[PDB]
DNA sequence: CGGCGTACG
DNA sequence: GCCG
């Protein structure tokens, strides 16, 4: 087993959910104590279970994985001897995690300001709403929308949001093109937003394009929250039989040269993208990012014209999206 | 022990 | 928290 998540297969289902599960909840609370080092180990830790061939039965087949130390591996003992792991069911029913969680969860809120609001006694979402001056423009946007924010996206929800993108962005610029990336081009059911990369295939023509391709959607009403640029960050009004719903919408813009790199960037997983930049940097000695490859040696940078290229460059078997499931 | 991704709004 |  590799020790980068980008050097293995990860598919979206796999056969150790309940294990990988609750090593997240440990990386998840690290997070809100803000320990990125073991935060990454337990999401290392978990996604090493999800590229496993098979149901971990016993400790021994630990041995040898990388990412599994005590901790970790206790934690799997637990869960094999007895169900349940107490540190994890400690931190599931902590008053701490569970409002955190809640507050993170908020368009416009981040763990810094959670943990200003429950250091000052908030708990709930109505504490947030009974105290407006404290909120920007955006938290208000993701608390009066949080309810249909919470609600999963779902496939037929990102085919008619396509649609109407599609349609903005060839008034914006003709001949522009409108690509799902994010978890829904990983294959997955649902999702918490719809995630599209716009390009054109003549370099350059999509300068300017997103604060047009914005204003069209605007004016047909689809709009109900946007900051206002190559990445915007929406809220957008879909119709539902008899009414609608509000739906995260991120759009981003790439001329067509960084295209490759920007698909990538966005077609996660987030555990995949830091994985294969932590790789090409510590391994390859190249600077990766979603808009090109560095080699800060020669002061150049990769073209590519494919995913496939990028992964070539960096010595990578490739992998199809739906093995970035990391 | 140092490192832990790297951007844009 | 774990790796190198
Ligand atoms: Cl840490
Ligand atoms: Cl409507
Ligand atoms: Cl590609
Ligand atoms: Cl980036
Ligand atoms: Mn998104
Ligand atoms: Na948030
Ligand atoms: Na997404
Ligand atoms: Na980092």
Avoid at 151 to 165: C, E, F, G, K, N
Avoid at 309 to 323: A, K, V
Wanted: glycine fraction near 8%.
């Amino acid at each position: 087993m590799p020790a980068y998540a980008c050097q293995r297969p990860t598919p979206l289902t796999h056969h150790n959910t309940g294990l990988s599960e609750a090593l997240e909840i440990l990386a998840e609370a690290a997070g809100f104590e803000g320990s990125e080092g073991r935060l990454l180990t337990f999401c290392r830790a978990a996604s090493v279970l999800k590229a496993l061939p098979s149901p971990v039965t016993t400790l021994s087949q630990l041995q040898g994985l990388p990412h599994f130390g005590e901790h970790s591996s206790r934690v799997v003992q637990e869960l094999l001897e007895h169900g349940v792991c107490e540190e994890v069911e400690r931190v599931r029913r902590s008053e701490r995690y569970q409002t955190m969680k809640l507050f993170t969860q908020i368009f416009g809120v981040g763990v810094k300001t959670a943990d200003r609001w429950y250091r000052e006694g908030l708990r709930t979402l109505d504490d947030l709403r009974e105290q407006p001056q404290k909120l920007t423009q955006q938290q208000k946007a993701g608390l009066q929308h949080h309810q249909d924010l919470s609600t999963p996206v779902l496939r037929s929800d990102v085919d008619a949001l396509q649609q109407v993108v599609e349609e903005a962005v060839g008034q914006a610029l003709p001949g522009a093109t409108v690509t799902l990336t994010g978890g829904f081009r990983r294959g997955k059911l649902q999702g918490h937003d719809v995630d599209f990369l716009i390009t054109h295939p003549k370099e350059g023509q999509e300068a300017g394009l997103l604060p047009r391709v914005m204003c069209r959607l605007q004016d047909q009403g689809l709009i109900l929250y946007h900051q206002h640029f190559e990445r915007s960050f929406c809220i957008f009004r879909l119709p539902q039989p008899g009414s609608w719903k509000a739906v995260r919408v991120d759009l981003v813009v790439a001329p067509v040269s960084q295209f490759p790199f920007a698909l990538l960037g966005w077609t996660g997983s987030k555990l995949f993208q830091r994985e294969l930049r932590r790789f090409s940097r510590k391994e390859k000695g190249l600077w990766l990012n979603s808009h090109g490859l560095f080699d800060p040696e020669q002061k150049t940078f990769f073209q590519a014209a494919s995913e496939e290229d990028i992964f070539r460059h960096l010595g990578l078997e490739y992998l199809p999206p739906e093995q970035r499931n990391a």
